[PDB]
Each structure stands twice: as C-alpha cells, then as structure tokens.
Amino acid sequence: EGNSVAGIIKSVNETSGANLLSSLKTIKAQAAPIYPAAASSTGYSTQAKIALFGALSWILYRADGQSKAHEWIVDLNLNVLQAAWLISFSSLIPFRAVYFAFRGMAPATASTLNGLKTFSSISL
Amino acid sequence: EGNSVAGIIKSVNETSGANLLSSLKTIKAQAAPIYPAAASSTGYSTQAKIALFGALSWILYRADGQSKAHEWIVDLNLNVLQAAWLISFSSLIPFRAVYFAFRGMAPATASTLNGLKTFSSISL
Amino acid sequence: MAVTSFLGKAFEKYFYDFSAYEQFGLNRFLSSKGQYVALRHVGFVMVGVNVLLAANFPFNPPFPTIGMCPAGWEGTWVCQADKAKALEMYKEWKKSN
Amino acid sequence: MAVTSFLGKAFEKYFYDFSAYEQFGLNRFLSSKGQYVALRHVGFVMVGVNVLLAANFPFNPPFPTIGMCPAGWEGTWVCQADKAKALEMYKEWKKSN
Amino acid sequence: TFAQRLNSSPAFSSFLLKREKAESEVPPSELELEAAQKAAELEDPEVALRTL
Amino acid sequence: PSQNLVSTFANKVIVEENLVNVAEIDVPFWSYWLSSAGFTSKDAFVKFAEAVKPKVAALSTSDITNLTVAFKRANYYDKDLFTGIEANVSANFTKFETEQLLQIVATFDAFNHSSVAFLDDVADSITYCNHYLAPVRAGADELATLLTYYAKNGHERADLLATVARGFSEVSLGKLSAAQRKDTVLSALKAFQTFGFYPESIEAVIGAALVSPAEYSAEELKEVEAVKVAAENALGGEFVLIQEG
Amino acid sequence: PSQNLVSTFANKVIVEENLVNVAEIDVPFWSYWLSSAGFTSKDAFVKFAEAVKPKVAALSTSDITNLTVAFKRANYYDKDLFTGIEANVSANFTKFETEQLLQIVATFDAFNHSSVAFLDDVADSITYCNHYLAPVRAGADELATLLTYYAKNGHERADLLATVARGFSEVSLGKLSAAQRKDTVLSALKAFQTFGFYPESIEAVIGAALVSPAEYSAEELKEVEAVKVAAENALGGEFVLIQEG
Amino acid sequence: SYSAYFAKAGFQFPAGLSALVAGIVALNVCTGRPTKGTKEISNAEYNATPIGYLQSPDQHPTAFPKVPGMKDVHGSPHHHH
Amino acid sequence: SYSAYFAKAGFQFPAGLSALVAGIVALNVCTGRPTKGTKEISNAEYNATPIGYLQSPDQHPTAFPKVPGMKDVHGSPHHHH
Amino acid sequence: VLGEVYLKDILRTPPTGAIPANVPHPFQTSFYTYATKKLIPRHWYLLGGFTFTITLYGILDGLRDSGKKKAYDEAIHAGKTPYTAGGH
Amino acid sequence: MKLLPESLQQEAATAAVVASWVLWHLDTQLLPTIMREHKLHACWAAAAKRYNEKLFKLNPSY
Amino acid sequence: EEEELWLLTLTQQFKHIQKHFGIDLPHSVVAHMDPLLIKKIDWETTNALEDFDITLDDMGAEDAKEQWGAENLSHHFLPLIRYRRDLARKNGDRYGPDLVNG
Amino acid sequence: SSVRDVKTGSLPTNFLTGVYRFWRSQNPAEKPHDPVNDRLLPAVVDASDKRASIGTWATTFFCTIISCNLLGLMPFNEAPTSGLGFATGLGVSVWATATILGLSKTGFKFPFIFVPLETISYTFRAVSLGVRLWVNMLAGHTLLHILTGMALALPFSLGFFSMVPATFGVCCLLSALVGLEYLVAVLQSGVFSILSTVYVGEFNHDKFIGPAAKIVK
Numbered sequence A, B: 001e002g003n004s005v006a007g008i009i010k011s012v013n014e015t016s017g018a019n020l021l022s023s024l025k026t027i028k029a030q031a032a033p034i035y036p037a038a039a040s041s042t043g044y045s046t047q048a049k050i051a052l053f054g055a056l057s058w059i060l061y062r063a064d065g066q067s068k069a070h071e072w073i074v075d076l077n078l079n080v081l082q083a084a085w086l087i088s089f090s091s092l093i094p095f096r097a098v099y100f101a102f103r104g105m106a107p108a109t110a111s112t113l114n115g116l117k118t119f120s121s122i123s124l
Numbered sequence C, D: 001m002a003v004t005s006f007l008g009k010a011f012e013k014y015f016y017d018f019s020a021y022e023q024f025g026l027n028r029f030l031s032s033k034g035q036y037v038a039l040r041h042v043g044f045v046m047v048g049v050n051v052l053l054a055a056n057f058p059f060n061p062p063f064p065t066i067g068m069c070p071a072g073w074e075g076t077w078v079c080q081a082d083k084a085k086a087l088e089m090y091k092e093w094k095k096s097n
Numbered sequence E: 001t002f003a004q005r006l007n008s009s010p011a012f013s014s015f016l017l018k019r020e021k022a023e024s025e026v027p028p029s030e031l032e033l034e035a036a037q038k039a040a041e042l043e044d045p046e047v048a049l050r051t052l
Numbered sequence F, G: 001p002s003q004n005l006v007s008t009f010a011n012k013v014i015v016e017e018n019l020v021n022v023a024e025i026d027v028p029f030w031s032y033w034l035s036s037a038g039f040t041s042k043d044a045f046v047k048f049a050e051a052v053k054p055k056v057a058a059l060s061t062s063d064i065t066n067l068t069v070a071f072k073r074a075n076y077y078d079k080d081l082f083t084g085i086e087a088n089v090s091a092n093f094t095k096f097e098t099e100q101l102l103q104i105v106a107t108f109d110a111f112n113h114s115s116v117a118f119l120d121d122v123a124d125s126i127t128y129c130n131h132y133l134a135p136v137r138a139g140a141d142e143l144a145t146l147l148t149y150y151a152k153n154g155h156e157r158a159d160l161l162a163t164v165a166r167g168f169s170e171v172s173l174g175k176l177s178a179a180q181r182k183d184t185v186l187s188a189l190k191a192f193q194t195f196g197f198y199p200e201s202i203e204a205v206i207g208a209a210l211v212s213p214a215e216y217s218a219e220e221l222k223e224v225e226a227v228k229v230a231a232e233n234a235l236g237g238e239f240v241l242i243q244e245g
Numbered sequence H, I: 001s002y003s004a005y006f007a008k009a010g011f012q013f014p015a016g017l018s019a020l021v022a023g024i025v026a027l028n029v030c031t032g033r034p035t036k037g038t039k040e041i042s043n044a045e046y047n048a049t050p051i052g053y054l055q056s057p058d059q060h061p062t063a064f065p066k067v068p069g070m071k072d073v074h075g076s077p078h079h080h081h
Numbered sequence J: 001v002l003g004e005v006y007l008k009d010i011l012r013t014p015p016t017g018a019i020p021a022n023v024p025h026p027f028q029t030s031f032y033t034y035a036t037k038k039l040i041p042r043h044w045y046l047l048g049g050f051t052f053t054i055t056l057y058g059i060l061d062g063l064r065d066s067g068k069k070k071a072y073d074e075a076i077h078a079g080k081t082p083y084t085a086g087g088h
Numbered sequence K: 001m002k003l004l005p006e007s008l009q010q011e012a013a014t015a016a017v018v019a020s021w022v023l024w025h026l027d028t029q030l031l032p033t034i035m036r037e038h039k040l041h042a043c044w045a046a047a048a049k050r051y052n053e054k055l056f057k058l059n060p061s062y
Numbered sequence L: 001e002e003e004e005l006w007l008l009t010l011t012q013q014f015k016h017i018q019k020h021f022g023i024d025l026p027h028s029v030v031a032h033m034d035p036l037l038i039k040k041i042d043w044e045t046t047n048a049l050e051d052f053d054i055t056l057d058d059m060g061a062e063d064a065k066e067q068w069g070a071e072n073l074s075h076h077f078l079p080l081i082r083y084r085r086d087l088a089r090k091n092g093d094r095y096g097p098d099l100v101n102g
Numbered sequence M: 001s002s003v004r005d006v007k008t009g010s011l012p013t014n015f016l017t018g019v020y021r022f023w024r025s026q027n028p029a030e031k032p033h034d035p036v037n038d039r040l041l042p043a044v045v046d047a048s049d050k051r052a053s054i055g056t057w058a059t060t061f062f063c064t065i066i067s068c069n070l071l072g073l074m075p076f077n078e079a080p081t082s083g084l085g086f087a088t089g090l091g092v093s094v095w096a097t098a099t100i101l102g103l104s105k106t107g108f109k110f111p112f113i114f115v116p117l118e119t120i121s122y123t124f125r126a127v128s129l130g131v132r133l134w135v136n137m138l139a140g141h142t143l144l145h146i147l148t149g150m151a152l153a154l155p156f157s158l159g160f161f162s163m164v165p166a167t168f169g170v171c172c173l174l175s176a177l178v179g180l181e182y183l184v185a186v187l188q189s190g191v192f193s194i195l196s197t198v199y200v201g202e203f204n205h206d207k208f209i210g211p212a213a214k215i216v217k
C-alpha cells in the first residue's frame, strides 16, 4: 500500500485539462482513508460468554456458600445492602462530567495536538 | 462478487478487434479463481500449544503416578514396550499404500467426478 | 428476538426515560430528585430485607434478637435462644407441621 | 532458530534418509530390512530394560525374582523377599552407605 | 467540530453516555462553528480551486 | 400500604401499552411467540405491522415465516405489509424451505392475496430450490392448501404438481384424523382435476376416500368418482383397492 | 560389546559434519550461539556462509546482527556475504537499532569493509531512525569503534558525530576498565580531531585522561593535549578539571 | 469514522488473564495439605468405610438452615466418646 | 492451488472438545464423596491437628521406591492400636 | 523529484486499504525481553520483597503447626481428647 | 470470627501473584499503550515550535 | 513539485492524526503512519525511561524537553535530507549540513 | 502473537495515565546545579537508572488494592484485603522492597543504644502498613454484619412491611455505613501507596555523577 499523496500526484498528472475538474472528486475519494463499515452483529463473543457464564458461575457459587454460612440471613442481606449502592451510583454519578474529568487526567486528551502549523508546510 | 463468466463476457464485449487477441491473457487471469498465497509461518497456534503442553502435562502426570505404583519398574518398562511398537509402525506401515487405501474406502475419492460431458454444454 | 439486542434496548429505555419520579407524579411529595434517590435507596433495602425474611420465615434467627418474638410463637423453636435446644424442638414440630 | 522449523527439518532428515541399516553397512549380517526392524525393535526393548534397571539399581524388586540375586548382595535388603523386613534393612544400610 | 466528532466517538455510543452530548460540557466556539462550515464548503475540491 | 403500592405499580407499569413498547426491537420474534400463547389483540398487531415494515425487506427466512403464521393466527391482514412479505419471498426464493413456504402460502391462502411473480417463485422454490422429498415430510393437510392456492389463482405449474403429489400417500394421510383427512382428500382432488393432472400418486388420495366411504356424502363421492374415472384413463387402467396381504 | 557399539555410534553419527547438517535450517541462530560457546572452525563457517547467502536479503534485523557478530568472533570474512549483509542494512536502515548497528559496524570495522551508501544508512539510522539517547545506553568502547570507522573511511557526518558524542560521559567511561578506557579515550580523540568536531561532551573524554595521566605516555598525552587546545578555542574557553564538592 | 472499527472486536479479556487464573488456581489446589475439613486415611480404611460414614456432619451444613447449626448428613454414629 | 489455504489455519481441536473435557472433569470432581483416601472430619479436629498428622502414610508413596511400600510421610504416631 | 523511495518506512499516509495490525511492543512480544530488560534490572526489589514475605509467612506457618503439634501430643500423652469432639 | 487463615503463606503468595501480575500487566500491556499516546502528544507539543521553524527554514516555497 | 511529496505527506499525516487523536484513532494507524515515532517511544519504555518527559519536567529542563520532542520527530526531515544529499552527491558536491564547518 | 488494537483516548487509558503520573509525582527527580544539555544528559539518564520504579510500584499497589477493596462492596463478594495474609502480605512486601533497596545502596550489609530504637520504629512500619489495610477492611465489614443482625431483629419480630419507622432509621444507618465503606476502600488504597512512596523513597537517593571536567566561559 503506497502512500496516497503519491497516488494523488500520479492521478492528477495523468489527467487532461478538460477532465481535471471533473476528476477531482474521484481522486479525492481514492485517497480518503479507510473507515471500515459497520458490519453485522455476531453478538456476544466466545470470551464474552465465558465472562458472563463465569460470572454467573461465580455468583451462584458465592451465593451457595453464603446461604450456609451460619450468618446466612445476614450474609444474604448484605448483598442487598451492597447492590443498593450500585443502583444509587447509576443514578447519582454524573457520567458525562466523569468522562470529561478523566479526559483531563491525561495530558494527551487535556489539550489539542500542537505541531505543524500549515504555513510552514505549504508547497507553492 | 459477481460471477467470472459475466466478467469474461463483459470484458470481451468492450474490447476492440485490434486489441482483442492481446487482451485475452488479462481477461483469462481476471477470471481465474483465487488460490491464496503461502503466507508466513506464525507457527504453533494458540491451540497447538495447549495440545502439546497439555499432552506434556499429561505424560508427566501419568509418569509421576506410574513411578509410585507398587509395580513401578514394571509400569515404567511397559512404556518402553509400548513405544517400541510406535517406532516399528513408523518403519513398517506403507504410508503411501495406506493413504491410497483409505481413498478407496470413500466412493467420493474412489472414482472421478462424472457429470457434464462437454458436448452437452457447448455454446456455438 | 436476538438475545443480546432486544432487552439491551428494553433495559436502555427502562434505565433512561422510564422514571417513576415523574410518571407517578411524586414531585408533589418530594423536594428534589436527589432525595427521591436517597429513599428509593433505603426503600430498596427495606423491601429487600422484608423479602429475604419472609421468603423463609419459620427460622430460628442466627442474629441476636433483642428479646422479641415474631408472632404467636414465644416459647417454640423459632424463639429459642439455645440452638441445640431449638434443633430438637424443630424436629418435633416438623412431624406435626 | 525458529523453534518449530529447525528440528522439524532435523527430525525429517533423521527419520527419512538417516539409516543405520546402510550407513553402518549391516547388509553383510542381516537378510532383509524387515528383520533389521524386527530386532531393532527387540534391541530397543533390551536397551530400555537395561537402562531403566541400571538408572536406579539398588532397589528391592517389586517383581518376583525367581530365586536369584544380583551381585554380592545375597542376604541384604536388595534380595529380601519380605518387604517390611527389607525396609528395616535398607534404613540400616542407608546410614552406613 | 470537536464536540461533534466526540458525539460519534465510540465513547458516546456506550450505555452510560448514550443520551449525552459532548457540546453539553464545553460548547463549540463561534470560530470553531464557522470553520466547520467553511471546511464543509471546501470538501468539494472544485469549489476550493475556484475560491483560490 | 403494601397492597396499595403494588396495585399502583400494576396499573402504570405492567400494561399492554408497555408490553408493545419492549416488543418494538425484534418484531417477528415477539409477534410469533405471543400469538402462539393466544394473544390476538387486533389493534396491538397494528403496532407490530408498522414497526416491522422498514425491516421486512431484510429479514431472514425464518423471520418471514414467523411473521406470516403470527399474522395468520391473529387473523390480521395488512395488505401493504403482505406485499413486502411476498417481495421478501420472491427476492430470496432460493433460501426458503418447503417447511417455510407451506406455512407462508397457507397464510396467503386464507387472506386471498397472490401475485403471479410470487406464485412462480414459490413453485420454483419448492420444485428446484428444495429437496424433492421435502413434500414427503410435509403432512398432507398443508400440501392440499398449496394445491388449492394454485387452483384458486388459476396457476398451472405442472412441475410443482408432480412435486406436491409425492407428499400424498397412505403414510401422509394416515397421520391425519378422519375429519381432517376428508377435508384434505376433497380439497386435493378438487385441485387435481382443475389442472387435469392425474399423477400416479393420485391413487392414494382417491383410495383414502374409497377405503372409508361412510364419512362421505353421495355428492362428495360423486366428486370423488368423477376424479377416479378422470384419472383411470389418464393413467391407463382401472382402480382397485388392495386388501392387505 | 556395549563399549564397542557406543564407540561405533560416536564415530559415524555424532561428528561435526552432521553438526553442520542440522545447522543448515536456521543459519544465524546456530551461527551465533555456537560461536559464543567457542566454536570458531574456519572451514565449518564456510558451510554457514554459503548456506545463508540466499537468505541474507530477507533476514530480520536481529538475524543480521547475529550473523555479523558471529562472523566477527569466528574472524571469517566472506566478502560476497558481507555485501549482502550491508545491502540488508542499507535497505532496511530504519528498522535497525543502535544496539544492533554498533555491533554490525564493529564487525565491518575489523574486516575493513565499507560502502558510501552503507556509511550513510548507518549514520542516518543512528541519528534519525533511532532514539537520541540510544548512544547513552551504548558503552563508550562501542561508540569509539563507530567514531574511528567513520574516520578511517573519511566520512564526515556532522549530525552523527553530535549523536555519538552524547554517549561519552563520566558515566559511560567509568564503566570501563582503565586499560579499556585508555584504548577508548585515545581512539575517540583521534576521531574527533580527524573531523575537527569538538562538541561540549569532548570535555568528558579529555577529562577521562587528564584525571589519571599516569596510565598514559608523554607521546599519547601530547596527542591528548593537542586535542585539548584544539577543543578549547572551539568551545571558547579553557579546560579545568573539577575536584568533586 | 473509526467508530465501526472498534465495534467489530467485541469483548476481550486482559492480555494475560489466563496466567492470573492459572496462578490463583495453582495456589488453591497445590496446597500440599488435605482439603480443608478432611483427613487423609489409609487405603484399608477407605475401602472398608461407607460413603455415609466418611462424611462428617460439619462439612455438610444445611443450605438454608431453619435452625443455626443444621447439617445435611450425620456421618458415623460410631463415636469414640 | 488451495494447498496454501489449508496451511494457514493450523492445528484446531475437534469442534466440541471443551464439552467433553468439561464433562469428564465434572464427573471426576462432582463425585459427591471424599477424595479417595481422605475422610471428612469436623472443623474442631481440622483446626486442632497439625498438617503432618492429617496426612496418612498410604496416601504419599515414595516417588521411586527402593523398597516396595516406602512412604514419604509418617503421619500421626498416636495410633489406636 | 522526491519520489516515495525516500519516504519508505519513514512516513506513511493514513491507510486506504485496510487498518493494519497494531505494532507490538517488545515486551508484549516476549516475556524474556520483559524479564531480562525490565523485570529483573528494575523490579527485582519488589520480587525480593515478595520473596521475603512468602518465606517469612512460611516461618510463621511452621511455627503455628509446631505449636499445634505440641498441644496435640500434650493431650494424647495426657489422656484427654485433643479437640472439643466437633459438636455433632 | 475468621482471623487467621488456613495458610498464611498461601494468602501471602496469592498477594504476590496478584500484585506481580498487575506489575507485569502494567509494564507490558498498559504502560506501552499509555506512553504511545502520551508521547505522541508530548513530542508534538514540545517540538512544535522548533519543528515549524525548522520546516519554515527548509521549504523554498516563499 | 520537486519536494512536494514530502511536504504533502507531512501535511496529510498530521491532519489525520489531529482530526482523530484522542477521539477514535486506533493505535495501529498511528504506528502505520508514524512507524519511527512509535519505534522511538518504545525505546523509552524498553529502556526504563517511560517517564523521561516527567523527569525533564521535575528538573525544570525546558530546553532539553524541547530537544526531546524535536529529536523524536527528527525523522520527519529524513526524506528531505536523504533526497538533498543524493542531489548533491550526483552533482559532485557535498551536502551542506553533513559537514562540520559547512 | 498479534496484539490487540487500542483506541487512543480511551477512558481506561486516560485514568491510568493520570494515576501513573500521580504516583510518579510523589518522588520527583531533583534538579542538578548544571543546565541540562547534551553534556548533562547521560548524568540525567543515569540518575533515572538508579532511581527505583516507585512510579510503577505505587500504581501496582494502588490498582491491586483498590480493586481488592472494592470487591468487598460488590454483592456476593468479599474483599481479598480483608484477609490477614493478603493485606499484611502486601504491607511486608512494600517494607521489604524498601529495605532491599536501602540495603543495596551499599553492599548488602545491614545497618550506640540509639539504633535499636530507630530499628524498632522502623520494623514496626512493616506490620503497620499491612495491618492498617487489614483492620480497615475487616472492621468496616464486621460492623456491617452486626448492624444488619440488629436491623433484621425488628422485621423478624414485628410485621413484614409493618412498624416501618423503626426499620427505616436503621436501614438508612446501614446504607450510610456501606457508603462510608466506599470511602474507606478508596482511601486505604491511597494511604497504602502514598506510604509506599514515602518508605521506598527514603532510600531513593544516589550521587549525581555530573561533569568532572569543564571548559568554562
């Protein structure tokens, strides 16, 4: 895969003057980058099924031994207390403000890229 | 991917009489089937390593419990008797005659395909 | 259905715009929504405690009761604070009941 | 090397054309090759038996000896046909040896 | 604009950010909005030649 | 107040207006299984028939079979949905099976809806795109529905009729109750004489009536004996029942 | 006959002619590890140098580094192999590392073999295709070998000399023994005056000699003091050793 | 624009998680001691004992016990009391 | 001609072997009985016993025994003989 | 002209054919490169500290079983049962 | 309650296996990815003044 | 149009990073477009200097931070100065910046 | 053999960038007297080669403890750092890492009646670093077990969904203790690894090599 500017330079050099201005949208699109198209689902990967069966195999096994733990009704009522905060965190955390607050932790996303200021790289 | 005969018919229809006989090797090769090229190795798949570590983890575990089996020297000298026949089978089985003898077990490989006898499907 | 694609879209519109804070009115009684969540939380605990107890009610409690008895039991195996004692009384009660 | 590509090619030319039936001559003494394999087989067993025994030789045999003793042992723990007896004699012999 | 390229990011098709908009955090400025429109005029390379 | 909160939850959260709001994602799954549980609900099925219309042109063949037999059981006939269904079938006719087409035709035979392009692409698919013993696995009450749908619409496909005539035998009619076998034998002989096609396996749908003629009238046995004489000179012989042994 | 069969097996199966018959598959693996165990064997390395010549144009960069430092340790110089090696380096110069090029150059500096296209593609790769602190991780006895290989061949690359001059400091020369530090300091100052390039880090290779002048002659310290006065007016000042504290 | 490239590869585990799970399991099964509530006996005792008498009552607590301390099995009544 | 297409996909297990290995393992670990040479004891005995006394000599045979019957551990000397 | 043999493997444009594979770090490629260049030169203080704890806690596990064995022998050499007989 | 474990060395080694996997995973998988996109941004923001001035002096287009 | 391939590859590659960095650009496309920047970044991680720009910020080295960034994009000018050197070599001269006094 | 592809600017990449750069900031490098240029660059690179990787170690212990502490707040799960050998086994391992670093600053030889009192207060750092993590994860979970037993005594005795102002005030006290446990889960993973940078950073000091010879003016 050669570079697309040498593909632009070649495709503009071997056109004529009459069909130059018509060819400029098919030389533009021949050198556009590939953004791969949204394929069909094929949902829940072979590892997303291990992650959900293995988490269900863990939650059932932990609730099995919680139910015979000599404080079994206190153990099973702590999962209600612990899952009550997972519900209150979905309803109280500002998830767009948290997303943009983690973007400021990283200096790569806290600013814009900064090089190559367009007046230095002209070709007139 | 449309069919290659309609690609042959189209590519021969829109050529001229002068460059017909020159174009016939690039219309031949545009409609040849893909035979994918021999890629680089990337040897021993993620499942060929499970198959050889899991077989080494089995052979070591079976030789571990064979060595404390109360007949341990008789057990470990039976693996020498059993592996002596795996060696004598690599040196006595006619492997090309066995390959062509299994090809005769299957009626799909015991003969050649039989339909479509070329004088029925001409287009003159 | 597609098993990952239906109820993901059902849970999405149960999560987001299904709101019993406004569909059941409820701004008439509650000041903010930050205190509707702060007692839907405590409401989830009180409901979950009362479901876990009632789903197996005749049980001798592992936790210390504070000197209280549930209903008309008061001397049975359900209220007995000695556990090897109440195991004997439960096995007698189970033949009758 | 490439770990799957070197010795696969080394084992291939050890399997196929490396032949001690002809490189060591050996047609002078053997009639066919079908009987060179039929005693390389028995030769592999006799070598493998003699290696497995010798790699741990001072051992009381689990198998029944037929009334025979290996070397100058003859009354020691190596030849003792009672196993709880020979465990006692091996533990005495191990302090000395 | 930047917030309009963030809205079509894989982050905002996630579940917790699905009904969110990136312009709600910091909106595009008037120069960023007028230069996204000016860049839309010049994605036709014939219009960019005749303008130049 | 425990009973009050549950009753308030039941009148605003679990109704059939939100049952059809979760049923908007995958329509022909929820359309098919609810209608099999007995949920007809004629104006809840109108919410189905417009939620699925931007999707009918890209459905799989088991989805199209699930739409038509659900909209048959709910008896609702949306003519501009059912032209998108027959344009799914007549565009993907090689992918449909005889198990699937015999259920789509019986929906299209109740709701008297046909095209000539649809009647060819169902007959092209049963005959050429499907296994030739797929009528034998069908059950003769579904094949007689296909035979009359081609005789109602006047469509003579003599290749399809030789295919559907395989699935009429003592085996396929013996699995029917004699109320349903009679409704099939009269329905199959009425279609076999409409085309004048008397295959060699018409002597199993005739012999399914003449071995038990006490369930038939003399008007219907005149219909049967009209086809028997019409098939006897076509096959070149005379009818004879067999006592087994 | 147990000793006879083992001795017969040892004189026909385990020799060095079959040790080089298993070594034909991957050459630069077996070439490198055997030569590190002390296996020079000048005419066993000729079997290497022709078995690898149809492969040198497609080797990875760690394979090319393994060929040259093996053929340096075995001291064997195949001029038509070593032009295929320098055509691997000068065709893939962006992929080589300074750790790898400083070992390839020291092979090419022993066997006095150079090209102008090779000397540019090694200097282009150390300066531009590699991290600018990769000379700091090098060890100054390898950088002085690179400095003289560019002064033997008369190749003035003033961008490469500013890069290699980073890797001369008190740190990099302090890790050398004083026999090897002296052989490096004289070898680095001889190359720094051949180009007349006196960087600001020449005062660490000069000061590595003037802090311990009892290992040097008066002929070599005249060589050192010639470079010190040549570097003093270039850097615009006077040399002064520092007593620490 | 690249959003549909990242939807193609779905879930994936962390890039060495099979060595964490094989390391935590290999610490919980290679304990070098009997399995927490059991005791190693001789083969003559294991071949002679019923499987109802090898079981201890402490190792089978009741899955949702109505009285705290209920066990599911009862074990050997041949106590050495 | 198609020979290089079949060299690309390397080794692969049979197409449901994870259900055979998870079925044979689930028969060897869900035995419903103690683990072949061990006996379930009470928690009061397990917390009070050293790990050298929980071990039986029969369950640790010697890895290459010089005398047939050698065991690696010796267990509890408090026999009930 | 400057003609794409000078830009080879130095500067490439955004891909038009397909998105390539990600370039591995040398540490993601091999554990031996991680172990010898980073894990042992830089993190051997942690691996020594994890080794000290596993060793020290094996001393304390050895002291705990030699104290269980001492209290066990002092009940079977003193005619008592060494535990509370389970409870059931 | 549960204070001492059944083996202290087994729990100390579970902590050393978990924390050495997190050390390996950070050093090998996370931190190469962190620094590939931290230092694309950081090298471009540090060079931007000297890159553009070097490029201004180079291209003959003015 | 003599050196327009290099100046427009720099323009088109940075414009695609800047449009997509921190939003949706994959790491495979960065390492495709800029393979020697990724190669030099990986050298710092391999050689235990993954915090080298934090080290230069701790010791206030603001001019060695600008040299650190400039030497890591140093290869962007390599397609030019390999071209201008092969002009001057085939024209008999020497390349200017290769020389000490020149 | 083929690594996965990462989107730039992902949220786990942005979080772990800020986390790593936080713990790296706790032991900053010291500015030399000289200006940092190509003369001083091997002395700066060698100054980084002799510093411990406390930026990496402290975010190893941050991320392995906050993941373990927050497991205790997931339903059906307990925190691994609520175990004595896990939590104190991380505390001794930080203390031994600091000591192995401080012992290697010499030649592994161990350093009147004062120094047994500097040692004791230093050897107690070993157990105090781990026991503070263990007791916080144990005492918060134990109080939650006791108060859930008390708050279950009221609906067990009184009516289910009856006499609800008595159980509402204690279900909101139970709910505010699980909320404090989310704060102690995040704080004790921070206090463990703030203190790991302090203890390991005590022996994180070596001599700047620097220029031994100069050309002034």
Ligand SMILES: [Zn+2]
Pocket: A075, A078, M078
């Ligand atoms: Zn709990």
Ligand SMILES: [Zn+2]
Pocket: B075, B078
């Ligand atoms: Zn056997």
